[PDB]
Design goal:
monomer, 6 strands, six-stranded antiparallel beta sheet, binds ligand A1AWU, alpha+beta, viral protein, 203 residues
């Protein structure tokens, strides 16, 4: 059970993600086998077309743009002042062939609605494709966090240790439309087992 301090710490994590703006993405740009037309029957949730959003610049709602999402696998999200460390890490890993890295589409997961986005007026959940990352990718991410200070991912209880879920976000859908969500997941599940090639860092 969550204690008084643990519940208060969860309020801090939510508010920290709401106030967090102007951050950099340390991810791996990838090529996906699915296309926009594959989800033609699906209705998507785009905050740029919605009303009641309290802070369009907050990272908790800013990137909820329907299926208009760049194909990429996020390794970590850190602050803007760490951009020199991230540039230094990309030069330290200059001899690493990122194109040899590869992921495997395992399962389609609809992430729960984050409380940070819901408080900002968002009504969308992320439908992603969970990936199986190799040891090379896991080691690249761990050394990345060793060179570049990165905030700890706290998506659940503050007491639980973070479990990295490597994924490619396919699109956001409304949280109050189960038929549209189930149909999207069923169509996305047809791409399970597809091998995903990395092209390089996200720019
Ligand atoms: N439940 C749950 N959710 C998880 C988990 N892991 C990740 N998520 C994601 O958590 C979110 C919850 O708050 C959301 O539910 C869900 O959405 P995404 O995975 O699509 O992430 C948003 C994208 O925008 C960031 N981003 C993009 N572009 C930039 C940029 N230019 N600068 C800085 N940041 C950028 C992210 O890095 C991108 O992925 C998890 O384990 N469990």
């Amino acid at each position: 059970s969550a204690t008084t301090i643990q519940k208060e710490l969860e309020n801090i994590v939510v508010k920290e993600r709401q106030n967090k703006k102007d951050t950099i993405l340390m991810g791996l740009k990838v090529e996906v086998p699915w296309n926009y037309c594959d989800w033609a029957s699906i209705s998507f949730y785009d905050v740029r077309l919605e009303s009641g959003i309290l802070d369009m610049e907050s990272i908790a709602v800013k990137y909820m743009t329907g299926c208009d999402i760049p194909p990429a696998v996020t390794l970590g999200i850190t602050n803007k002042d760490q951009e020199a460390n991230f540039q230094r890490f990309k030069e330290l890993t200059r001899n690493i062939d990122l194109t040899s890295l590869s992921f495997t589409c395992k399962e389609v997961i609809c992430f729960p609605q984050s409380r940070a986005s819901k408080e900002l007026g968002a009504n969308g959940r992320a439908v992603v494709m969970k990936l199986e990352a190799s040891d090379d990718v896991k080691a690249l991410r761990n050394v990345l966090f060793n060179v570049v200070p990165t905030p700890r991912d706290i998506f659940g209880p503050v007491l639980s240790d973070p479990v990295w879920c490597p994924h490619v976000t396919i699109g956001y859908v409304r949280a109050d439309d189960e038929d549209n969500k189930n149909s999207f997941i069923e169509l996305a599940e047809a791409f399970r087992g597809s091998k995903i090639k990395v092209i390089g860092w996200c720019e």
